[PDB]
Design a protein around this ligand. Structure first.
Ligand SMILES: [Mg+2]
Ligand SMILES: [Zn+2]
Ligand SMILES: [Zn+2]
Lengths: 589, 197
DNA sequence: TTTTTTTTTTT
């Protein structure tokens, strides 16, 4: 009854934020400056301003939304006439709806209402074009007339062809005219419920969502997203008569969120502590006793180095870690922790993986007999971390796919007439067991791990974990029993804060190596080479590839402390950890 | 509105090249020598010579492109009558269009406009033939009439058969006549975006 | 092509 365009338009112009900044008028600025055509409004903000407007949006969404959009378009038109003849429609998207429903609990009562669903994006289709207003021509020697068939409304999800010519009243043949047809961008994606919500003994459920207009290509597969929109039943084969009055539901997306100022302030405060590096290492797997050297290396892989593009070649910034340990050394517990704290990580197992599943799988569209690719584990981990457990138990045919990923950071696909090269810039963390149960110290690493030597050289660091009973058993027993009793360590950064810290560092920090750091690295290398030249009788090689590892590790240390330069201390720490690896593989100074 | 046919002809004949050599005339003569039927021009030269002509090419390419080809064809046959009886339609192609769009960034607003794309060829089909003007015969014991169904219009990409015989005004059965059907060479290729982008 | 269990030939 009461028009809400009046209260809405002044709400945009008059609203004060946390720091008294008038965000919405600032947000509306680049909408006309950069021609966004889409606006984002928080539900809490509109609720505090006027609850009557807020509750009308949730309930009567299908009616108030077109009215609100028209008011905003007029506001932009008077503010900048140049928007005309450029963008003819502006979308306003509402986020933060309190009505959040689990994927498994959707029932018929929620159809046609604005709801929010949290899940994981698993599938994305290429962008396509959908007709919303067609133009046909009547093929009848008398007629030769053109008209817009879905008059006075929009073309439904099912393409319907006119049967009677509206301009002559006769049936016959109608020809589509693509020149005068109105199109709109259209994309389809599949969302899956999070593994924490799946009930015992059940399999995860999936829901189909539709992204249109500017919402296309707003997310990548494997991302955790929050999506808001309207549910509706799906019609796909109306001509398929015969039983089956049962339909599936699909979601019509109106707004999507992936995964901000106070957090940035909180991150900066943490970096001010001189011992921030020690705190971060102590926060890696707090439930595991000992393994300080391994924890330090795992922290470095989370941050990584800085990739370098030379005149001809490319230098990867990712760090690869290989862990060999006796059974029961808590190898899998840390890998589970790493996959949970990293902003983007994929956890795989040697036995549960295949070559097609790791890189890309060809799917034949039975409906049209068409071939298209599906992203594999390594591709989904691009820009993140790939964790592989029990690498020694993987099939040899499935292991060769990893060889290209670690070396060239690329995956080559040539099958079913599809040729492409895919980026796989991901850090690889692998764990394995020795050949004969426990580890034999006297024998070299190569004959004690059951892996080809060609893959050993591709790892920046290798660690050996030995479960030798001794005087530390009492401390380990006391620590474990405390964990089972609920006792937790203090001064530990929680997972959520730690994940945000890593994401910020990987995005805004690019350390640069100073001259002093370069001299120390060069001096250590040449003196090591001279020492190694006397007797290079070790299974672990000392090739110049180790020099790149030293560069990467030093950059990671600087990035951990949010430093813009690599100083003497960072280079010294990188040498120490590199020296331990060069001597813990069974070869002495 | 303004007939650019005269402007196009003088532009070709009076184009100041790197040394005012009128290279467009040189390639026109080369085209006549080997019967190439395809003339390529640079958008920068057109814009420098007459920016108004350049805008019309880049904006109304659906309408004015056949007009320019007709003007060029008349000039060629006037220059050399022997070009006739060999090529009935010359081709003019534009290069260096400033409107460059990334492949992933294509949206609905770019449909029906002249754009350029950079990529990698992956698949190429063998050369085939496409019908653009078919000839049909009405199989109705009183008709025995032949006609070209797509009257005053090029045959669309969808092969459609007439429903009413235009010559006799009756429905029925129609048979295609390959011997009186116009054909054009047709090939399909697939372009893939570069891995860098 | 792809994963799977099966009998079969052939990589
Ligand atoms: Mg394990
Ligand atoms: Zn009609
Ligand atoms: Zn007839």
């Amino acid at each position: 009854q009461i028009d809400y365009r009046d209260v809405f338009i002044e709400f945009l112009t008059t609203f004060k934020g946390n720091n008294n900044q008038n965000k919405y008028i600032e947000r509306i600025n680049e909408l006309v400056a950069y021609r966004k055509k889409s606006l984002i409004i928080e539900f809490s903000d509109v609720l505090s301003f006027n609850e009557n407007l807020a509750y009308e949006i949730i309930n009567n969404t299908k009616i108030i939304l077109p009215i609100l959009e028209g008011a905003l378009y007029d506001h932009i038109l008077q503010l900048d006439p140049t928007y005309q003849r450029d963008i003819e429609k502006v979308h306003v998207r509402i986020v933060g709806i309190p009505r959040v429903i689990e994927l498994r609990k959707i029932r018929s009562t929620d159809i046609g209402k604005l709801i929010t669903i949290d899940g994981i994006l698993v599938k994305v289709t290429p962008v396509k074009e959908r007709i919303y207003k067609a133009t046909y021509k009547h093929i009848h020697p008398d007629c030769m007339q053109e008209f817009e068939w879905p008059e006075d409304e929009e073309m439904p999800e099912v393409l319907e062809m006119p049967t009677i010519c509206p301009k002559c009243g006769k049936p016959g043949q109608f020809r589509l005219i693509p020149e005068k047809t109105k199109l709109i961008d259209w994309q389809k994606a599949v969302i899956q419920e999070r593994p924490e919500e799946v009930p015992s003994g059940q399999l995860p459920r999936q829901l189909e969502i539709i992204l249109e207009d500017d919402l296309v290509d707003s997310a990548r597969p494997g991302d955790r997203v929050k999506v808001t929109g309207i549910l509706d039943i799906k019609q796909d084969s109306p001509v398929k008569r015969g039983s089956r009055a049962v339909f599936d539901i699909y979601m019509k997306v109106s707004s999507i969120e992936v995964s901000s100022e106070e957090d940035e302030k909180k991150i900066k405060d943490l970096a001010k502590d001189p011992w921030i590096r020690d705190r971060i290492i102590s926060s890696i797997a707090p439930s595991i006793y000992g393994h300080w050297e391994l924890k330090e290396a795992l922290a470095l892989a989370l941050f990584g180095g800085v990739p370098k593009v030379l005149e001809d070649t490319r230098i990867r910034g990712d760090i690869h870690i290989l862990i060999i340990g006796d059974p029961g050394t808590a190898k899998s517990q840390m890998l589970q922790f790493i996959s949970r704290v990293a902003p983007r990580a994929v956890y795989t197992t040697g036995k549960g993986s295949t070559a097609a599943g790791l890189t890309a799988a060809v799917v034949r569209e039975k409906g049209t007999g068409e071939y298209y690719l599906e992203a594999g584990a390594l591709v989904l981990a691009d820009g993140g971390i790939a964790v592989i457990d029990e690498i020694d138990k993987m099939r040899d045919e499935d292991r060769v796919a990893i060889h290209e990923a670690m070396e060239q950071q690329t995956v080559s696909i040539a099958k079913a007439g599809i040729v492409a090269k895919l980026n796989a810039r991901a850090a690889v963390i692998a764990a394995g067991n020795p050949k004969f149960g426990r580890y034999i110290s006297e024998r070299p690493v190569s004959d004690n791990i059951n892996l080809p030597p060609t893959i050993l050289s591709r790892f920046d660091l290798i660690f050996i974990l030995k479960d030798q009973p001794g005087e530390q058993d009492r401390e380990l027993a006391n620590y474990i029993l405390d964990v089972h009793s609920g006792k937790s360590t203090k001064n530990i950064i929680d997972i959520d804060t730690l994940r945000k810290y890593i994401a910020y560092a990987r995005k805004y920090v690019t350390p640069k190596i100073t001259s002093e750091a370069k001299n120390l690295i060069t001096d250590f290398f040449v003196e090591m080479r001279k020492k190694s030249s006397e007797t290079p009788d070790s299974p672990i090689l000392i090739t110049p590839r180790q020099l790149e590892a030293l560069i990467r590790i030093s950059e990671a240390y600087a990035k951990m402390a949010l430093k813009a330069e690599v100083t003497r201390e960072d280079a010294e720490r990188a040498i120490n950890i590199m020296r331990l690896f060069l001597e813990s593989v069974g070869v002495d100074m």
